[PDB]
């Protein structure tokens, strides 16, 4: 169902989206579709002023890797953002 997120995803406007979609062109700037991996991640991070490793990066996909896909499609991604922002810990 994941409706609690729908509303959230509905809240976001074309504005916050754009700025976001843009980053979407970096995470999967070398992916077939829109799935992110520990390899792509480090790519963005590095451009965000962060230079992590492949061991700590995987922990980023793991969470979103609820389907054990190994990567982060265009769905789980946005969610992971609304999961912390509107519920960090």
């Amino acid at each position: 169902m994941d409706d609690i997120y729908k509303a959230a995803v509905e809240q976001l406007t074309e504005e916050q989206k754009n700025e976001f979609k843009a980053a979407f062109d970096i995470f999967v700037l070398g992916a077939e579709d829109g799935c992110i991996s520990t390899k792509e991640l480090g790519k963005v991070m590095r451009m965000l002023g962060q230079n992590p490793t492949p061991e700590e990066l995987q922990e980023m996909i793991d969470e979103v890797d609820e389907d054990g896909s190994g990567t982060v499609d265009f769905d789980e991604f946005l969610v992971m953002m609304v999961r912390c922002m509107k519920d960090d810990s």
Binding site: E19, F20, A22, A23, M47, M81, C84, M85
Partner: peptide, 17 residues
């Protein structure tokens, strides 16, 4: 604590020139 703004950096031209 996804600042978000940090991303804008990776999406600021991305070598468009």
């Amino acid at each position: 604590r996804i600042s978000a703004d940090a991303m804008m950096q990776a999406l600021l031209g991305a070598r468009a020139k």
